[PDB]
mmCIF file with all atom_site columns, C-alpha atoms and ligand atoms in Angstrom:
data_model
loop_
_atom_site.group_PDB
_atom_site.id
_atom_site.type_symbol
_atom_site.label_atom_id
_atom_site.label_alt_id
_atom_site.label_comp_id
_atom_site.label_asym_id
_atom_site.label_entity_id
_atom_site.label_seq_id
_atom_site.pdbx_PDB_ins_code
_atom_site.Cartn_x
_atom_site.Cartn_y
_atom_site.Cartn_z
_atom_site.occupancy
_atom_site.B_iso_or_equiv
_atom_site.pdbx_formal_charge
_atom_site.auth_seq_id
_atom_site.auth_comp_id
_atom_site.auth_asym_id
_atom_site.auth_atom_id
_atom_site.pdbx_PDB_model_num
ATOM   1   C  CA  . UNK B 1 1   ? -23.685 14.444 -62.389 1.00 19.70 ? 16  UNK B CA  1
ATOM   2   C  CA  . UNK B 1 2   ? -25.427 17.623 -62.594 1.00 22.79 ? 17  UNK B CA  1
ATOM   3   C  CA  . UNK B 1 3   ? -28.056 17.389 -60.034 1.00 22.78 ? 18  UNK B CA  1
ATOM   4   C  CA  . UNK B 1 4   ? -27.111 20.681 -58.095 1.00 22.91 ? 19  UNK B CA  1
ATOM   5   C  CA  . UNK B 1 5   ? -27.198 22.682 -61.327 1.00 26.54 ? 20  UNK B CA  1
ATOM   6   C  CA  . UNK B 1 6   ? -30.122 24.906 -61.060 1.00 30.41 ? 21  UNK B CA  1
ATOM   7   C  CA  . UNK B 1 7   ? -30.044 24.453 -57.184 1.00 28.22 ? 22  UNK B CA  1
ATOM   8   C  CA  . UNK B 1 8   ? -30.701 28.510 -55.922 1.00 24.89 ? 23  UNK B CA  1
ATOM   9   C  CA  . UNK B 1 9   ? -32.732 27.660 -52.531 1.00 26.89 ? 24  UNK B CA  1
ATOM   10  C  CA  . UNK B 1 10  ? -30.249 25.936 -50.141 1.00 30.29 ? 25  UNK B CA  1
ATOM   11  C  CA  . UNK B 1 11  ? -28.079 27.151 -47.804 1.00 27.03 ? 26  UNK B CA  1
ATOM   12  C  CA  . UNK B 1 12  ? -25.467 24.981 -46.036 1.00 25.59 ? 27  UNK B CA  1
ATOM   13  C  CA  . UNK B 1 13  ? -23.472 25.304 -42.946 1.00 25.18 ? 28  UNK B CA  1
ATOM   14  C  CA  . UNK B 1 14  ? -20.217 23.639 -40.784 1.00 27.93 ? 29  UNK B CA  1
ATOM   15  C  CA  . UNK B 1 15  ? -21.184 21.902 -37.483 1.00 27.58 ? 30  UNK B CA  1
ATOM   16  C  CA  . UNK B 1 16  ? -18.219 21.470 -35.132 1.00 24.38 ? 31  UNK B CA  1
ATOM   17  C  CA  . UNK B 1 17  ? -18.690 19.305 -32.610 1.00 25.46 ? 32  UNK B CA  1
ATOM   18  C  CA  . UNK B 1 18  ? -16.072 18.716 -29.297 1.00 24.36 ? 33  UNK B CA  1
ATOM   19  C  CA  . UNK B 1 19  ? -18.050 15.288 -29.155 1.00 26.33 ? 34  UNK B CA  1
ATOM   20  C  CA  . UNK B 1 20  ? -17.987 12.405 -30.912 1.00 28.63 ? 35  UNK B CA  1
ATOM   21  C  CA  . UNK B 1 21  ? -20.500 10.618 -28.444 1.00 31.98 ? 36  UNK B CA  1
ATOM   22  C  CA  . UNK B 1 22  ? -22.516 13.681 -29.374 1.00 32.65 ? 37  UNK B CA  1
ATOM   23  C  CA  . UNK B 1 23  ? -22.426 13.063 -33.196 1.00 27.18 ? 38  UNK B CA  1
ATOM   24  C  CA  . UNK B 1 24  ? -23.649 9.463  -32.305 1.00 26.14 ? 39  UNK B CA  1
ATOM   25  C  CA  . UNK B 1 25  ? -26.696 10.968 -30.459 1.00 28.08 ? 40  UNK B CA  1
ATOM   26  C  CA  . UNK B 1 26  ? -27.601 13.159 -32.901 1.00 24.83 ? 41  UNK B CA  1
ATOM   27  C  CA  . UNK B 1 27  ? -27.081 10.249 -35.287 1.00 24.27 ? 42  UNK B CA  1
ATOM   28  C  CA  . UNK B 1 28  ? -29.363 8.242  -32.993 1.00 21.67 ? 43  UNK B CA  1
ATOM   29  C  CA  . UNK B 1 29  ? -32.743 10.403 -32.415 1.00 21.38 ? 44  UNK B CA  1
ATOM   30  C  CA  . UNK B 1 30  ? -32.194 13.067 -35.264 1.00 23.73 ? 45  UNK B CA  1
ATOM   31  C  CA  . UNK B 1 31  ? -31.306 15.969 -32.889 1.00 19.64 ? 46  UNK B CA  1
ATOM   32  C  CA  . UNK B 1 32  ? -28.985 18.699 -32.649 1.00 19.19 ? 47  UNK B CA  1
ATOM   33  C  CA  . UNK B 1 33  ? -28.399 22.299 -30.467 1.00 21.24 ? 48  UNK B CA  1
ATOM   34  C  CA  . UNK B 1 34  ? -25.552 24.565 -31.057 1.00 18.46 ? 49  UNK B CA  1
ATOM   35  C  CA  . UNK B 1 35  ? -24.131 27.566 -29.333 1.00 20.71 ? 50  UNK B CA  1
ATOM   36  C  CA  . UNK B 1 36  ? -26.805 30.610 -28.511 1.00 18.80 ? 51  UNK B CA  1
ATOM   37  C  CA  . UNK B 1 37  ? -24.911 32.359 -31.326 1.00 21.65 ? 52  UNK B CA  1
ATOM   38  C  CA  . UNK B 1 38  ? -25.172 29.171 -33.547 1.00 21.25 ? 53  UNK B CA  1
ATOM   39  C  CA  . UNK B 1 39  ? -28.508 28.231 -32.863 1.00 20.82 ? 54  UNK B CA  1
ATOM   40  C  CA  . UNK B 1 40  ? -29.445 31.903 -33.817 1.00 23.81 ? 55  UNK B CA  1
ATOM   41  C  CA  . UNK B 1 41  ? -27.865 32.136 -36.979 1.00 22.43 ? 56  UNK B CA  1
ATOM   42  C  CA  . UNK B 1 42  ? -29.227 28.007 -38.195 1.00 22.01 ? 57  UNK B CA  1
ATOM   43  C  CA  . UNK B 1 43  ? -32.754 29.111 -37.079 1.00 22.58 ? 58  UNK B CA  1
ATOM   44  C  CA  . UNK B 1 44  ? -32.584 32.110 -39.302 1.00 21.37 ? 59  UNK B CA  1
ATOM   45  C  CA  . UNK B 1 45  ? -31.690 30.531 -41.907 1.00 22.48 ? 60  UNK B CA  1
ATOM   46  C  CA  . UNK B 1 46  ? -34.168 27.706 -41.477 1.00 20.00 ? 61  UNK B CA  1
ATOM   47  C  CA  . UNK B 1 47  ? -36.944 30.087 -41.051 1.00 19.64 ? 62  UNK B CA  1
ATOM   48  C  CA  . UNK B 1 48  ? -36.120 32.285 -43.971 1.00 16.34 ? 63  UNK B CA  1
ATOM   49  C  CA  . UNK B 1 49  ? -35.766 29.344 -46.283 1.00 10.59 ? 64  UNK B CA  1
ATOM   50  C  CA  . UNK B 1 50  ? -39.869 28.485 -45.454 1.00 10.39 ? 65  UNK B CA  1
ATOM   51  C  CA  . UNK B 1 51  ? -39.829 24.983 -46.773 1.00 10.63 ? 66  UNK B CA  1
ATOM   52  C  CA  . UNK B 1 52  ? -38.202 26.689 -50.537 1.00 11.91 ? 67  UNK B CA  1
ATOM   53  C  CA  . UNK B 1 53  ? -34.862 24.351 -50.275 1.00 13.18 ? 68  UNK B CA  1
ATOM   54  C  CA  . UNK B 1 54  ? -32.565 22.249 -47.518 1.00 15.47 ? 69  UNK B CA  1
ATOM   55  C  CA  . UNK B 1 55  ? -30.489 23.729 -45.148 1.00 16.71 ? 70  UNK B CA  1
ATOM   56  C  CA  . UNK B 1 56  ? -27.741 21.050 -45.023 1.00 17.90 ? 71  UNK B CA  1
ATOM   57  C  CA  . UNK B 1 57  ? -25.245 20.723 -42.332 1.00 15.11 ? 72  UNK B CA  1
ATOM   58  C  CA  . UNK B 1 58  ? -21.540 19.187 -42.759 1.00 14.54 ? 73  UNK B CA  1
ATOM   59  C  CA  . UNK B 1 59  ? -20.605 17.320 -39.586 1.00 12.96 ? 74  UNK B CA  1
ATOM   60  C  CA  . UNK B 1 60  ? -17.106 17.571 -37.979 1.00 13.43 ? 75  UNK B CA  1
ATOM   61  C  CA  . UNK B 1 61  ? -15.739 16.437 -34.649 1.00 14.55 ? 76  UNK B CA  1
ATOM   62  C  CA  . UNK B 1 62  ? -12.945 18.995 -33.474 1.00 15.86 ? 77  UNK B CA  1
ATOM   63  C  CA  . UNK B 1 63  ? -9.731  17.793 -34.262 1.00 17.48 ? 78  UNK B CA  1
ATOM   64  C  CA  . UNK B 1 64  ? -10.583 14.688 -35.667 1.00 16.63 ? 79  UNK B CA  1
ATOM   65  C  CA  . UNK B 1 65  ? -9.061  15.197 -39.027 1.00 18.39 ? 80  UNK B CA  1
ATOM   66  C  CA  . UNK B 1 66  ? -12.420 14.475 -40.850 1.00 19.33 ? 81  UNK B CA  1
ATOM   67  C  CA  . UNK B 1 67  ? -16.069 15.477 -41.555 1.00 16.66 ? 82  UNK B CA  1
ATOM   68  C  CA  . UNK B 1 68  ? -18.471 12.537 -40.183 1.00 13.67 ? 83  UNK B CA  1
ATOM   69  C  CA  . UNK B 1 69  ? -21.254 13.084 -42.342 1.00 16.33 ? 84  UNK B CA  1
ATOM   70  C  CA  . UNK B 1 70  ? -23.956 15.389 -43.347 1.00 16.05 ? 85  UNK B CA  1
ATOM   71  C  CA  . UNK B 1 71  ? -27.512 16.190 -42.018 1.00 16.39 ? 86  UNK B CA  1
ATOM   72  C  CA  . UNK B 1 72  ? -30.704 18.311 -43.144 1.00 17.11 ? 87  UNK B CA  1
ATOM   73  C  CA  . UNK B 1 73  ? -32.112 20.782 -40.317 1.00 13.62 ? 88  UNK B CA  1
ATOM   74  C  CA  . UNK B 1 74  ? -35.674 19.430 -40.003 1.00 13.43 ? 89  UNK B CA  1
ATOM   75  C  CA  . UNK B 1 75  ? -37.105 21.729 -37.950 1.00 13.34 ? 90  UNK B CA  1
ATOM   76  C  CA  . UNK B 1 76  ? -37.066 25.338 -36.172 1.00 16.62 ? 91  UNK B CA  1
ATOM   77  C  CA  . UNK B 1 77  ? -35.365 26.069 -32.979 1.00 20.04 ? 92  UNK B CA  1
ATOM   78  C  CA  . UNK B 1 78  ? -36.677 24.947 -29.736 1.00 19.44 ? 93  UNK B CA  1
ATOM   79  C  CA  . UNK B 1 79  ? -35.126 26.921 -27.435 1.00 19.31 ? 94  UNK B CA  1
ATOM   80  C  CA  . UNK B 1 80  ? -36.601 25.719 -24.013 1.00 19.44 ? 95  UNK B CA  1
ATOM   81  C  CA  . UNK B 1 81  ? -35.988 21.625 -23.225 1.00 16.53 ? 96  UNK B CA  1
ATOM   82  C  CA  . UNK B 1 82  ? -34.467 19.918 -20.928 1.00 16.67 ? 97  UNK B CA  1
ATOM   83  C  CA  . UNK B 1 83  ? -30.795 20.417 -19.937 1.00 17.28 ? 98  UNK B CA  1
ATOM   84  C  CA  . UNK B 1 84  ? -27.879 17.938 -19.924 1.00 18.62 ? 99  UNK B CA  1
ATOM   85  C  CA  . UNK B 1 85  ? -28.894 15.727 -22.445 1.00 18.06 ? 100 UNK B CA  1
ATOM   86  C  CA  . UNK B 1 86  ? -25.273 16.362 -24.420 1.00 18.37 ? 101 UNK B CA  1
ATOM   87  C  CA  . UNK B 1 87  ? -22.026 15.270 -23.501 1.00 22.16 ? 102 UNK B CA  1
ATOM   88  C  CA  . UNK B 1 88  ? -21.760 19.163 -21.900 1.00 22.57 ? 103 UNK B CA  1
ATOM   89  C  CA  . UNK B 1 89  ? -24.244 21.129 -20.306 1.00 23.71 ? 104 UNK B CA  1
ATOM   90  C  CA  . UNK B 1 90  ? -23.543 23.843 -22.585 1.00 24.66 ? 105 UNK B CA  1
ATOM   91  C  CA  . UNK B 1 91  ? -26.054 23.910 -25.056 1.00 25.14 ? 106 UNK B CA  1
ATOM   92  C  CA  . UNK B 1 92  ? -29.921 25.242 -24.777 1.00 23.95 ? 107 UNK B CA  1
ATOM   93  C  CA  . UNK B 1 93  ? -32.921 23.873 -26.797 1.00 22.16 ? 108 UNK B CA  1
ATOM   94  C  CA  . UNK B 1 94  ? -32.897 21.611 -29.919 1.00 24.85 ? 109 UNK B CA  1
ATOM   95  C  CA  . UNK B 1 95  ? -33.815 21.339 -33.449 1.00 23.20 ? 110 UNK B CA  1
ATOM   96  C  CA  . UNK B 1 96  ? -34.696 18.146 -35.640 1.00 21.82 ? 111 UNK B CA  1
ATOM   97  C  CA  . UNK B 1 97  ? -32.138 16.688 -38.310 1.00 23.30 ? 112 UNK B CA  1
ATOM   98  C  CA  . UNK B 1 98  ? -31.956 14.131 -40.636 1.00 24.42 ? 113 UNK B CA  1
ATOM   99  C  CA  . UNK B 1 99  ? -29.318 12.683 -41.270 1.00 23.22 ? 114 UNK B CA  1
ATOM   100 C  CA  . UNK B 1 100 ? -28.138 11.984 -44.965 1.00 19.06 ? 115 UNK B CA  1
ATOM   101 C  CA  . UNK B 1 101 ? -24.776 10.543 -45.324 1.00 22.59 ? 116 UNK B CA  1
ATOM   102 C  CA  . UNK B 1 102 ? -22.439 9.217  -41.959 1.00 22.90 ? 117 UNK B CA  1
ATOM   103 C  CA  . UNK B 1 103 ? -19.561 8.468  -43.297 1.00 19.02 ? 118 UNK B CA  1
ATOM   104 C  CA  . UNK B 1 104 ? -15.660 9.668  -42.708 1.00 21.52 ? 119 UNK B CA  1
ATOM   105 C  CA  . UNK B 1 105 ? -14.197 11.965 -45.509 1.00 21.44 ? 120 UNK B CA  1
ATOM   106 C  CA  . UNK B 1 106 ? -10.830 13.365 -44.892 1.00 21.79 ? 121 UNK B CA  1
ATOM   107 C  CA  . UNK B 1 107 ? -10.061 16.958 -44.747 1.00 24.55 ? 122 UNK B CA  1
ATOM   108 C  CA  . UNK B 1 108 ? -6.974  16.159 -47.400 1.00 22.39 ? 123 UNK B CA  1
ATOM   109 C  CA  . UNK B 1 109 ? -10.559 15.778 -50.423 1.00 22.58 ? 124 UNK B CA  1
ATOM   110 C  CA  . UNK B 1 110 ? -12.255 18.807 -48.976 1.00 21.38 ? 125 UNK B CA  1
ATOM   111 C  CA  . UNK B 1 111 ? -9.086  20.966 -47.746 1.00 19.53 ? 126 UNK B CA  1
ATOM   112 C  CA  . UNK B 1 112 ? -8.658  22.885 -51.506 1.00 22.89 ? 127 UNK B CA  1
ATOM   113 C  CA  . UNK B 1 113 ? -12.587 24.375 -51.184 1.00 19.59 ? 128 UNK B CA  1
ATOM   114 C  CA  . UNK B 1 114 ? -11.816 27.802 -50.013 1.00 16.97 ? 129 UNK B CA  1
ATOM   115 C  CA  . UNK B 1 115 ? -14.674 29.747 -48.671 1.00 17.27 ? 130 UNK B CA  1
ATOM   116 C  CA  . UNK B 1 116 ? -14.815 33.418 -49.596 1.00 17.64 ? 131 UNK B CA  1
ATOM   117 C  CA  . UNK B 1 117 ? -16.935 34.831 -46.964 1.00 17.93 ? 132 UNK B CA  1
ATOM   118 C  CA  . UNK B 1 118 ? -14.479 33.513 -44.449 1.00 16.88 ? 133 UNK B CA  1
ATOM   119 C  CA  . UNK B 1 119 ? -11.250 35.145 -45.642 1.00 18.40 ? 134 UNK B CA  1
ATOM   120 C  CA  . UNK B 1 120 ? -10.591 32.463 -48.604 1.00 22.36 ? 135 UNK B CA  1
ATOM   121 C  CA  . UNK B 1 121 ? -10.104 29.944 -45.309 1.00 22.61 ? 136 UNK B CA  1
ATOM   122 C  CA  . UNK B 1 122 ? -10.047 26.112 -46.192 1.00 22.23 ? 137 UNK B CA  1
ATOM   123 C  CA  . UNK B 1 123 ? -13.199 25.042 -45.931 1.00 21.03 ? 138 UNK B CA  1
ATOM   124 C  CA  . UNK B 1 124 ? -11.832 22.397 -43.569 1.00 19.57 ? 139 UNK B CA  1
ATOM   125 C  CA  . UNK B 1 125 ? -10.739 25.287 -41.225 1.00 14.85 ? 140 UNK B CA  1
ATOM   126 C  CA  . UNK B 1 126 ? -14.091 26.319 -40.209 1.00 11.56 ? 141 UNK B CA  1
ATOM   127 C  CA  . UNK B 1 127 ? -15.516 26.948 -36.552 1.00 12.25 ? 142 UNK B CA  1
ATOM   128 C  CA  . UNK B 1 128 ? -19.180 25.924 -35.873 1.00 9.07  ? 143 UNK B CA  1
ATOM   129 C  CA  . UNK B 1 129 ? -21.672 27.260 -37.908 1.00 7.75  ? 144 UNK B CA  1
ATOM   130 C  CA  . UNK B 1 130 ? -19.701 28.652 -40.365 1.00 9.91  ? 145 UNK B CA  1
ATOM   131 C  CA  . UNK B 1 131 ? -21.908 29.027 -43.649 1.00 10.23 ? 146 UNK B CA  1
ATOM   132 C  CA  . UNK B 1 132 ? -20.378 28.131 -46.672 1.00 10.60 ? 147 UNK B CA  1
ATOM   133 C  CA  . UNK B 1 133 ? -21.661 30.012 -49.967 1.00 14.07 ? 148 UNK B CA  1
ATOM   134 C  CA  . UNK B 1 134 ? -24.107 27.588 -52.306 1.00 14.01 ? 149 UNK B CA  1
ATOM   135 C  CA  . UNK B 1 135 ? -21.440 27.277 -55.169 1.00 16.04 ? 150 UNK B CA  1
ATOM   136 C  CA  . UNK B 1 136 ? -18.489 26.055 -52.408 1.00 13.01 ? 151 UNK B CA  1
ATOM   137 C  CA  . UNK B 1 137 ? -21.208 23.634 -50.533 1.00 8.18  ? 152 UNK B CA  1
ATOM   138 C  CA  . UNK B 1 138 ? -22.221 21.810 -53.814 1.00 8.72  ? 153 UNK B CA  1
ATOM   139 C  CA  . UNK B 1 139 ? -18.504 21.335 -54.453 1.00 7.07  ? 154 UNK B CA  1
ATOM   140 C  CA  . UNK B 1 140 ? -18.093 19.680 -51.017 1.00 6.58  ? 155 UNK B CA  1
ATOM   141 C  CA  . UNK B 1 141 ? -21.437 17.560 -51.265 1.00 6.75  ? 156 UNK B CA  1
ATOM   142 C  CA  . UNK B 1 142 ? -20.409 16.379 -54.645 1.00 7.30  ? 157 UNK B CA  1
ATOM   143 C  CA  . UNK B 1 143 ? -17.159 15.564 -52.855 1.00 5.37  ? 158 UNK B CA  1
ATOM   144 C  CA  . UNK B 1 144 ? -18.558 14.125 -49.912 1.00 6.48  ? 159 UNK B CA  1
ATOM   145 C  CA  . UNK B 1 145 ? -20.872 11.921 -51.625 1.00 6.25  ? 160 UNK B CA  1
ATOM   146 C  CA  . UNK B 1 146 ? -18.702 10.214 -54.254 1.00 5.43  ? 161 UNK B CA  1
ATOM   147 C  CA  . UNK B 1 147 ? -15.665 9.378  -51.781 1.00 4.77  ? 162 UNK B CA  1
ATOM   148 C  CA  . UNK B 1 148 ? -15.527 5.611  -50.814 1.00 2.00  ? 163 UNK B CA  1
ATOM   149 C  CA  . UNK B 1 149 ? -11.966 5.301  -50.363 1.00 2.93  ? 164 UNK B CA  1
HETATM 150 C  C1  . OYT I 2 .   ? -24.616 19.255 -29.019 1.00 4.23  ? 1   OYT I C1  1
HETATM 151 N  N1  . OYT I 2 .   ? -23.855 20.269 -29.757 1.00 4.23  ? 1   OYT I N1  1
HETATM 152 C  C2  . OYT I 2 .   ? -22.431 20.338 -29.590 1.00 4.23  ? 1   OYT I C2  1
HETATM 153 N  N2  . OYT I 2 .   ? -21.755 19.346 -28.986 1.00 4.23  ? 1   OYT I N2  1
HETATM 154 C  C3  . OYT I 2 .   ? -20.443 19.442 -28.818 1.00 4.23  ? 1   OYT I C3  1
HETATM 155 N  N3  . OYT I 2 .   ? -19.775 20.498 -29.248 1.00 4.23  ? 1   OYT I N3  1
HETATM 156 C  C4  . OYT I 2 .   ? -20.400 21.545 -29.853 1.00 4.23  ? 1   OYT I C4  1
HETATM 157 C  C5  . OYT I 2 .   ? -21.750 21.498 -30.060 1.00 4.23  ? 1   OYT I C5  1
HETATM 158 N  N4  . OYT I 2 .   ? -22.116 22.653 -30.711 1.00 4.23  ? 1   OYT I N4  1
HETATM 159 C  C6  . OYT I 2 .   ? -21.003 23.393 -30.886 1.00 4.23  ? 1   OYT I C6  1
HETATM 160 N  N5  . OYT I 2 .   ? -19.967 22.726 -30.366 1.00 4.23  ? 1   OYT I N5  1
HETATM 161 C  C7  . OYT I 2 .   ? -18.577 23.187 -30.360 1.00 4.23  ? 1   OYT I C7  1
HETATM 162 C  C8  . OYT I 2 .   ? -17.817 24.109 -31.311 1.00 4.23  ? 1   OYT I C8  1
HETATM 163 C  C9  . OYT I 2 .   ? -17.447 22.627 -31.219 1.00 4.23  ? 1   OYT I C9  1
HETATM 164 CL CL1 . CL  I 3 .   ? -35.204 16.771 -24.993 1.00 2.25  ? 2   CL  I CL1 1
HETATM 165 CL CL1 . CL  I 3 .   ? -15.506 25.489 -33.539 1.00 2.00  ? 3   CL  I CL1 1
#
């Protein structure tokens, strides 16, 4: 399996989510919103990436022991529409996904990834919107996509 060889133009990011009836939503009308902060930084990202790769986004709820899937951001940030539509009235605007894989994968087959850019932290110890560097993401999608246990 060498698909991601050659891969330069993606970028890939940790969602934490303190909702799991949120993570069915999303999974339900390909949506998301984050924090101001986190919306900031994933519309960046999107927006500097014009259409030249995926920005990919690795699902966790908080605490849960597990990632829940993974999702392309499909869109820029809409950052005026209406309130309360999440589990909290926290979050402002939305952005489009697509969702790729839902499926459980422990944190004991991704917990050895180490991320660099965030103090050689497990990649399983991440807060929302942590970005992972390209070589540490393909690791984890590799990872992610060939567990069935
Ligand atoms: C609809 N978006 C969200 N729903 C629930 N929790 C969220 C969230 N975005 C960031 N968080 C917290 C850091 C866990
Ligand atoms: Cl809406
Ligand atoms: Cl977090």
């Amino acid at each position: 399996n060498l698909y991601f060889q050659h891969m330069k133009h993606g970028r890939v990011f940790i969602i934490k989510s303190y909702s799991e009836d949120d993570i069915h939503r999303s999974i339900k009308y390909n949506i998301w919103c984050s924090t101001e902060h986190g919306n900031k930084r994933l519309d960046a990202a999107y927006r500097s990436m014009n259409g030249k790769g995926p920005v990919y986004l690795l699902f966790s709820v908080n605490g849960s022991g597990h990632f829940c899937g993974v999702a392309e951001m499909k869109s820029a940030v809409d950052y005026n529409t209406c309130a309360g539509v999440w589990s909290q009235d926290k979050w402002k605007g939305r952005f489009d996904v697509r969702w790729i894989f839902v499926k459980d994968v422990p944190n004991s087959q991704l917990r050895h990834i180490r991320l660099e850019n965030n103090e050689n932290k497990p990649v399983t110890n991440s807060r929302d919107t942590q970005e992972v560097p390209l070589e540490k993401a393909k690791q984890v999608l590799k990872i992610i996509a060939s567990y069935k246990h």
